[model samples]
Target: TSILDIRQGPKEPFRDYVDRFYKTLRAEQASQEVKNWMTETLLVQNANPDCKTILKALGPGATLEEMMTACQGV
Candidate 1:
């Protein structure tokens, strides 16, 4: 029902999982704080190394929109 309830499944592909995650988030008009939290949560749980690489590249203060943009091209 909420973004907090969503998690990437073990066998799920990155794009599919991200699509589902974003769908769950779309239920609400999320604030930047909420988006950032979800972004951090997703990166932490993602199996893809690229997520970590992007996180490192963006450094500590990166926003959810930035990560989303990075992910779109992958």
Candidate 2:
């Protein structure tokens, strides 16, 4: 299985990073654990701190599914 090679850079736009993460994930079947971690990696380590704060303020119940819907703006 290929690793999900994505990390949000300081200057990169959030939607752009999310787009790249989506495309790469679609192309790779990174193992279940890696797949899960990659999703958290995107939500937690995202360049946008506000993203996490907003999600947290809503509740401790966010998922990659919500991640997709939220960032599908791009």
Candidate 3:
């Protein structure tokens, strides 16, 4: 894992943030558990209705790609 702080940027769309994280993680590997944790943490911190809905609908056994897909057009 790289030493970096992952946080959603101000005025950044959820999809963009998700894609950015995805791309960043592509160059580095993190456990699924860690990724899930990061996803929830970021979304909760950012606090958006669409993100909350995506997280709620995603429930368990979901990944970044799944979250992105669920959040699309939302």
Candidate 4:
């Protein structure tokens, strides 16, 4: 992962940094195959609410399926 060093930068301008990073990401690897895989790869895919719960439980110690199972039970 590339680091985007924005020392002492305003958080509001971070969107611009994120956008630029996405542009760089597209330039470096813009492949339909990768995008397709990303679209389908998540075991427990939801936005807003469960994202935090899922991420908090995710790590090397647990596989995706285990995380999904735990999240489902939660």
TM-score result, candidate 1: 0.50
TM-score for candidate 3, residues paired by index: 0.49
Worst ten in a row by lDDT for model 4? 3-12
Candidate 3 lDDT at 74 equals 51
**Which scores better on lDDT, 1 or 4?**
1
- Residue by residue across 1-74, what tens digits does model 1's lDDT show? 76656655555545676677768777768698978786666645653565546556766776656666765544
Query: What is the model-wide C-alpha lDDT for candidate 4?
Result: 0.40
Ranking by lDDT: 3, 1, 2, 4
Residue 38, candidate 4: Cα error in Å is: 0.6
- Please report, as a residue range, the 10-residue window in candidate 3 with the lowest summed lDDT: 1-10
> Which parts of model 4 have CA positions greater than 4 angstroms off?
1-45, 60-62
Q: How much is the lDDT of residue 8 in candidate 3?
A: 56
Q: Give the distance in Å from residue 64's predicted Cα in candidate 4 to where it truly belongs.
A: 3.2
Number of the top lDDT candidate: 3
lDDT of 2 by residue, 1-74 (tens): 33334666655556677777768788866688987777665545654555555455545466656754554432
Cα error of candidate 2 at position 9, Å: 6.1
**Candidate 2 regions with alpha-carbon error over 4 angstroms:** 1-13, 64-74
What is the per-residue lDDT of model 3 for residues 37-69, given as tens digits with 9 covering 90 to 100? Answer: 765565545535656665776787777677777
Q: Root-mean-square deviation of each candidate, in angstroms?
A: 4.4, 4.3, 4.2, 10.7
User: How accurate locally is residue 71 in candidate 3, as Cα lDDT from 0 to 100?
Assistant: 62
Model 1, residue 56: displacement in angstroms?
8.7
